[PDB]
């Protein structure tokens, strides 16, 4: 996937309403554990999910999630997440700080590892 | 003022967090009256108004407004409002419905006049 023309746009809308959220989920058990998730998302009022359906078609990869009065586009996990984020990034501005921070995690994962997430404190506590 | 390169971006961020608000203010007295205002705006947490200061410098024309925990870029009135909106518009998507609707009002004003505003019901009541 190659874009660049509208990649300029989506950086805008993202910097507007666009979450490059990343988090650590429990694994190997349940409480203080070890297995993460990196997620790009956009959530518009269910009033207009067609744009959210447009995001999916423009971006190709992804899905819309119906959550009541709001729905949301969720790319999901590393696979298509690296082709997208990598391409977006250069049209940075606001939220493209973590565009990189996420792109960082999406790499070399065989301890400075699973540490970037908290650093991704875009007002996320603990 | 001519842009087009980032005009693609600002359409994004606008479609994200960007108000092309328009309204009728009272005049010639006080209650049911006749004198309007067309306003482009962007309001980010005072956390990061530098972007709001960037909007002003990129867009040139405008001012940031400190309102407590939030601040906002307010272009203001027709003058620079027509060069901007007109240029933005073609990079439409979400909010560029009213980009036009506003551009409409910003014209021929000597009765279908001052009627577009309510039509600019982006969840604005009465």
């Amino acid at each position: 996937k190659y874009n660049k023309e509208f990649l300029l746009y989506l950086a805008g809308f993202v910097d507007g309403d666009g979450s490059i959220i990343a988090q650590i989920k429990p694994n190997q058990s349940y409480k203080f554990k070890h297995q993460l998730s990196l997620t790009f998302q956009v959530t518009q009022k269910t009033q207009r999910r067609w744009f959210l359906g447009k995001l999916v078609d423009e971006i190709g990869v992804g899905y819309v999630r119906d959550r009541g009065s709001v729905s949301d586009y969720i790319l999901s996990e590393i696979k298509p997440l690296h082709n997208f984020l990598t391409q977006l990034q250069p049209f940075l501005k606001l939220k493209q700080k973590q565009a990189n921070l996420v792109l960082k995690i999406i790499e070399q994962l065989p301890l400075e590892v699973c540490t970037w997430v908290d650093q991704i404190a875009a007002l996320n506590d603990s």
Side-chain angles (χ1 to χ4, degrees), chain A:
Chain A
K1 171 182 160 295
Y2 335 78
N3 316 88
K4 291 70 175 186
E5 282 297 324
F6 99 125
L7 284 180
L8 292 148
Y9 172 95
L10 202 45
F13 197 113
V14 161
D15 272 357
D17 206 298
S19 310
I20 302 177
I21 42 199
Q23 48 189 283
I24 173 172
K25 316 213 165 215
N27 198 35
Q28 301 175 201
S29 194
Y30 68 127
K31 180 60 194 43
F32 195 142
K33 300 299 154 290
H34 31 358
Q35 216 269 153
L36 69 182
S37 319
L38 310 320
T39 327
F40 157 70
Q41 173 167 124
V42 159
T43 163
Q44 301 292 279
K45 294 245 214 58
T46 221
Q47 280 182 197
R48 41 74 164 54
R49 81 100 181 148
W50 58 266
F51 181 76
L52 256 49
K54 174 195 276 65
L55 282 163
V56 178
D57 301 338
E58 293 180 282
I59 300 186
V61 61
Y63 73 112
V64 178
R65 199 228 305 255
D66 180 317
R67 263 194 312 144
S69 55
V70 207
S71 296
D72 41 41
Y73 171 101
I74 315 181
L75 181 45
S76 300
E77 316 321 289
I78 311 88
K79 331 83 181 298
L81 245 205
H82 88 107
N83 62 65
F84 185 74
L85 283 193
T86 295
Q87 235 167 106
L88 228 200
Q89 196 264 69
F91 308 120
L92 341 83
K93 296 266 178 66
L94 193 53
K95 318 213 179 196
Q96 253 72 84
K97 312 167 199 172
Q98 44 256 164
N100 168 233
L101 273 154
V102 181
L103 244 341
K104 256 175 186 177
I105 309 219
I106 302 154
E107 268 152 52
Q108 300 164 236
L109 44 169
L111 305 188
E112 199 52 305
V113 300
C114 54
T115 66
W116 317 114
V117 169
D118 275 305
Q119 194 194 304
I120 295 175
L123 300 180
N124 288 335
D125 284 86
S126 299

